[PDB]
């Protein structure tokens, strides 16, 4: 099998940019979209496997989605509303994923919005200058209100009175307004000294339970309970100072408190809040003077968030589970069972482009992902009980991970490269920081590959394999993984000497070792691909086919039905057309002077923009997948020049693709939409890229 999406991270510092409806469905704003997650029996997962599935996306905003709210009107749980930095509030139908209608009434950056609990078509939004819009979407009416000249942070319509709205501001002011009286302030709730992050009305009416009660949470570290009869505080809760628990986080990351609330309908004397470090607390409001709280997941370690929580969304499933979804700066979405306070499951997410994918040949299914948010992911893709078993590695990364390559035999041994030219070596079976190469590339590391050492390293006095890195400046370095703080060698010195070259060497943009370790291909800025032999990188062939910079080279595997297939090399450049070359003749003749090839073995045309990655299926003879800036991945029968299927699920430009190690039908792709998709070739109805 089934497709999977590792989605972009839920947006930070938004008072309501996620919500859920019963059954049910969870939605979260992420970059310029909302992602939708089915939760409960309707996700259709096997027993024990978490019952959720990422099922769709609301696409159409052109800037950060700042706000998201579902309708909570029976029969209309499929309706929802968004706000965005693009200046619009949109009403969507999640069944069609389409806009129903929208407005652009705001003139200043929108802060938040909320769908009225009492009025079927009313959405109330507020902006950074203090302007409020009431929007009755289904009768084409709207009204502006202006309360106080202050930056709105949060807004929540009363569940009990259709005209009443609570508004919290950046400076700590809280008001209750009546929208039928031009926004008249009915109660000014004084007490907070800093940003209001959340306002939750008591789900029961009256002040007997434990007028109405309101709770507010603030950056000032207090939760205040208010009597909305008498406009006065009745209780102050102050966050506890708790020891941090779980895996150690990066201390250099700036993190200030976000104090959000959920007031549960089934337990009206209790109040859930976030806390420092993203711990969740259940407060007993019957105590409350005494300030009694209970930590979520108090009796089990490794389940709590590790950074601040922004939003909390209740969801009652069709099989009656009382769930609560949390979003966090730590990039995990967690689902809690409120009846037990245990974490039911975790959905990880990505905060940058998915630049690189690498499957381990040692630990089958272990998929490393290089991400623009400064953390390497390792996805245990074959985890039986968890569709999203992902571990994060942050130590010594601290920049965009643009290249990855597992060692071919050594468990845990992961090379990485970054956009600032850094080359490092992780031991993912340890908690140690990675070893960093003393030598940096001047530009981004495009590619890493393991191969036999060559001189001068091979003459010392190592290891079985050297680590090769290619930077955007055009140098390929040979690194000794047992002396990374030592000297790395520019292989051009060897290439020049071995081949008696007098003119300048080409700017290298790609490196690919043949599977047997005997042949190294370099792709160059001028489009040429050069073929070199061990031990001293003797040039045997120059392929002149591409007319723009080479991005990607892949050699076919050696476990096909014919051993001749291991001489096939696919390549992609900044042009759209892909080529395959058959290097059998030249490599077997082992020529004393180099051959030039100027005609392809096969030509694969159909993409309409640059090719970033090509890969051969380990399950087939001559089946290729390609990733393109045209926003598609294409599967080809390369030997017959037949396009087979075209995956269009990404919104971005694709940067990487990898075949699943065990399923012939499954492919993984990453893009600049901050997504990784696992998709099935059998589910793709389009045979070629859009023309
Ligand atoms: Na406008
Ligand atoms: Na698309």
Question: Within the largest sheet, what's the order of strands?
Answer: 42-43-44-45-49
Distance between termini?
30 Å
Q: Assign a percent range to the helix content.
A: under 10%
User: What's the quaternary structure here?
Assistant: monomer
Structural class: mainly beta
| Largest pleated sheet | 5 strands, mixed
What's the CATH class of the largest domain, please? Mainly Beta
Bound molecules: sodium ion
| CATH level-two architecture of the largest domain | 7 Propeller
Q: Supply the number of helical segments.
A: 2
- Count of structural domains: 2
| Whole-angstrom Rg | 29 Å
CATH topology of the largest domain: Methylamine Dehydrogenase, Chain H
Overall 3D shape: elongated
WD repeats: 60-102, 105-146, 148-187, 191-236, 252-293, 305-346, 349-389, 396-436, 440-478, 502-542, 545-591, 606-646, 649-689
Organism: Homo sapiens (Human)
Subcellular location: Nucleus, Nucleoplasm; Nucleus, Gem; Cytoplasm
Protein name: Gem-associated protein 5
Q: How would you briefly describe this protein structure?
A:
The chain has 2 domains: 1-343, YVTN repeat-like/Quinoprotein amine dehydrogenase (Methylamine Dehydrogenase, Chain H); 344-691, YVTN repeat-like/Quinoprotein amine dehydrogenase (Methylamine Dehydrogenase, Chain H, 7 Propeller). The chain is 2% helix and 45% strand. The chain is built from 2 helices and 57 strands.
Could you please describe the fold and organization of this structure?
- The protein has 691 residues and is mainly beta.
- A 5-stranded mixed β-sheet has the order 42-43-44-45-49, with helices on one face. Strands 1-57-56-55 form a 4-stranded antiparallel β-sheet, with no helix packed on it. It has a 4-stranded antiparallel β-sheet with strand order 2-3-4-5, with no helix packed on it.
- The two termini are 30 Å apart.
- The protein is elongated and about 95 Å long.
- It is 2% helix and 45% strand.
- It folds into 2 domains: 1-343, YVTN repeat-like/Quinoprotein amine dehydrogenase (Methylamine Dehydrogenase, Chain H, 7 Propeller), CATH 2.130.10.10; 344-691, YVTN repeat-like/Quinoprotein amine dehydrogenase (Methylamine Dehydrogenase, Chain H).
- Bound molecules: sodium ion (NA) (2 copies).
- Residues 631, 648, 650-651 line the site of one sodium ion.
- It comes from Homo sapiens.
- The modification Phosphothreonine is found at residue 49.
- WD repeats lie at residues 60-102, 105-146, 148-187, 191-236, 252-293, 305-346, 349-389, 396-436, 440-478, 502-542, 545-591, 606-646, 649-689.
- Residues 11-13 are annotated as: Interaction with U4 snRNA.
- Residues 1-122 are annotated as: Important for interaction with U1 snRNA.
- It is classed as splicing.
């Amino acid at each position: 099998q089934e497709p999977r999406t590792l989605p972009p991270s839920p947006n930070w510092y938004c008072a309501r940019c996620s919500d859920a409806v019963p059954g049910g469905l969870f939605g979260f704003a992420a970059r310029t979209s909302v992602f939708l997650v089915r939760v409960g029996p309707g996700a259709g997962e096997s027993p024990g496997t978490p019952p959720f599935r990422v099922i769709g996306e609301l696409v159409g905003h052109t800037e950060r989605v700042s706000g998201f709210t579902f309708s909570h009107h029976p029969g209309q749980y499929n309706l929802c509303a968004t706000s965005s930095d693009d200046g619009t509030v949109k009403i969507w139908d999640v069944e069609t994923k389409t806009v129903v209608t929208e407005h652009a009434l705001h003139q200043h950056t929108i802060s938040t919005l909320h769908w009225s609990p009492r009025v079927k078509d009313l959405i109330v939004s507020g902006d950074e200058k203090g302007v409020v819009f009431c929007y009755w979407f289904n009768r084409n009416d709207s009204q502006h209100l202006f309360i106080e000249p202050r930056t709105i942070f949060c807004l929540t319509c009363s569940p009990h009175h259709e005209d009443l709205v609570a508004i919290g501001y950046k400076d700590g002011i809280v008001v209750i307004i009546d929208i039928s009286k031009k926004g008249e302030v009915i109660h000014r709730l004084r007490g907070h000294d800093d940003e209001i992050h959340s306002i939750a009305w008591c789900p029961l009416p009256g002040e007997d339970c434990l007028g109405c009660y309101l709770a507010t949470g603030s950056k000032d570290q207090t939760i205040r309970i208010w009597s909305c009869s008498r406009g006065r505080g009745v209780m102050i809760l102050k966050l506890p100072f708790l020891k941090r628990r779980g895996g150690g986080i990066d201390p250099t990351v700036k993190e200030r408190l976000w104090l959000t609330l959920h007031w549960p309908s089934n337990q009206p004397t209790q109040l859930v809040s976030s806390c420092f470090g993203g711990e969740l607390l259940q407060w007993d409001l019957t105590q409350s003077w005494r300030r009694k709280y209970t930590l979520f997941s108090a009796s089990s370690e490794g389940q709590n968030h590790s950074r601040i929580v922004f939003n909390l969304c209740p969801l009652q499933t069709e099989d009656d589970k009382q769930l609560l979804l949390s979003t966090s700066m730590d990039r995990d979405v967690k689902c809690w069972d409120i009846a037990t306070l245990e974490c039911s499951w975790t959905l990880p997410s990505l905060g940058g482009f998915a630049y690189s994918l690498a499957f381990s040949s040692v630990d089958i299914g272990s998929l490393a992902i290089g991400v623009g948010d400064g953390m390497i992911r390792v996805w245990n893709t074959l985890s039986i009980k968890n569709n999203y078993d992902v571990k994060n590695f942050w130590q010594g990364v601290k920049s965009k991970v643009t290249a990855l390559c597992w060692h071919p035999t050594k468990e845990g041994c992961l090379a990485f490269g970054t956009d600032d030219g850094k080359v490092g070596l992780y031991d993912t079976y340890s908690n140690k920081p990675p070893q960093i190469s003393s030598t940096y590339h001047k530009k981004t590391v495009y590619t890493l590959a393991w191969g036999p050492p060559v001189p001068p390293m091979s003459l010392g006095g190592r290891p079985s394999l050297a680590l090769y890195s290619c930077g955007g400046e055009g140098i390929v370095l040979q690194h000794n993984p047992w002396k990374l703080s030592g000297e790395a060698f520019d292989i051009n010195k060897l290439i020049r000497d071995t081949n008696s070259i007098k003119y300048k060497l080409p700017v290298h943009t790609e490196i690919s070792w043949k599977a047997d370790g005997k042949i190294m291909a370099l792709g160059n800025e001028d489009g040429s691909i050069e073929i070199f032999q061990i031990p001293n990188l003797k040039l045997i062939c120059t392929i002149q086919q591409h007319h723009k910079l080479v991005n990607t080279i892949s050699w076919h595997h050696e476990h096909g039905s014919q051993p001749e297939l291991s001489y096939l090399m696919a390549s992609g450049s900044n042009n759209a057309v892909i080529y395959v070359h058959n290097l059998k003749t030249v490599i077997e003749s082992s020529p004393e002077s180099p051959v030039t090839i100027t005609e392809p073995y096969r030509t694969l045309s159909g993409h309409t923009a640059k090719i970033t990655s090509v890969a051969w299926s380990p399950h087939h003879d001559g089946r290729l997948v390609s990733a393109s800036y045209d926003g598609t991945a294409q599967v080809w029968d390369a030997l017959r020049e037949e396009p087979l299927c075209n995956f269009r699920g990404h919104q971005g430009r694709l940067l990487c693709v990898a075949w699943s190690p065990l399923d012939p039908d499954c492919i993984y792709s990453g893009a600049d939409d901050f997504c990784v998709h696992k998709w099935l070739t059998s589910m793709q109805d389009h045979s070629r890229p859009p023309q």
